[PDB]
Amino acid sequence: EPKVPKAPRPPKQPNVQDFQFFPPRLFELLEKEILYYRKTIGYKVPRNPDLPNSAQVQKEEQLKIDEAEPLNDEELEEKEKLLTQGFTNWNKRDFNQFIKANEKWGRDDIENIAREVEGKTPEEVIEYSAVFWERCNELQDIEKTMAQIERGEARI
Amino acid sequence: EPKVPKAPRPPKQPNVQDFQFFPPRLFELLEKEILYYRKTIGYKVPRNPDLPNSAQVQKEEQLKIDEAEPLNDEELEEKEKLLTQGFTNWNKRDFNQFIKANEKWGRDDIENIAREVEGKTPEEVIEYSAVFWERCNELQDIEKTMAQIERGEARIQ
Ligand SMILES: [Mg+2]
Ligand SMILES: [Mg+2]
């Protein structure tokens, strides 16, 4: 069991993914919603043993919940648009197939990559690839994913 | 927002979907985990002043939380198995394409339904279809969904 359980999130919040490359502003808005949700259910931040200024960390995090407020019409307007500015049509399977195809054919072989990504057209793949190679650093576990593809691309 | 905020769930809980038809026992086990999570974070059930005898309901719910316990070894083993007894490889796009293909070609045209479900072969479609028609009654917006399908099969005549 976690020394500190993961803090709760709004049950009906959108399941946006890192590989969909939405803009960072979207997550700032999502974090506002998460903090407000925590305020509404009376969530209290547990103090963390290690960290020295634990009392300071805990207080900092609680204050963020304490001062949380709903998203106003402006912000709500902004979020709606932001949710269209990502690769909403790319799911986990598309991503995994994209990664395996790159390892197999090399990031250059767009024709073969698209052929192996079942839910996507060459057009969709060229567009996604351009963004992927531009901000894949934002992803998590990429250092391992980049070496994995580099091993296969170089192994060819 | 809701009058009463939705109660918290473990952020790390498996994301099982209704259209994946997992055994109902699995959700009974996931509920035990949700209750233990709520106990674990100190969550308090709010009193819904609009239920009549809301005091009793509140106390009943809070007791379920207060008496919550983690899953034992047996249940942990049962859960791991149940997590493989659903259509784990069927995602939301597969499901949406399946539904639209049934409306577009009729439920018996496996050849065309499979062609339109990009990530599934005809064999996988038959297996899913066999369960779907057995308990699609468990799905959220089924009446509407089924009416539309019965309509597509109607236009086809
Ligand atoms: Mg393709
Ligand atoms: Mg198919």
TrEMBL record, chain A:
The chain holds residues 749 to 904 of 1046 of the full protein. Belongs to the SNF2/RAD54 helicase family. ISWI subfamily. Residues 85-137 form the SANT domain. It is found in: Nucleus. This is ISWI protein. It comes from the Eukaryota. Mg(2+) binds at A114, V117, K120. The gene is smarca5.S. Residues 58-85 form a coiled coil.
Automatic annotation (TrEMBL), chain B:
It is found in: Nucleus. Mg(2+) binds at A114, V117, K120. It comes from the Eukaryota. Residues 58-85 form a coiled coil. Residues 85-137 form the SANT domain. Belongs to the SNF2/RAD54 helicase family. ISWI subfamily. This is ISWI protein. It comes from Xenopus laevis (African clawed frog). The lineage of its organism: Eukaryota, Metazoa, Chordata, Craniata, Vertebrata. The gene is smarca5.S. The chain holds residues 749 to 905 of 1046 of the full protein.
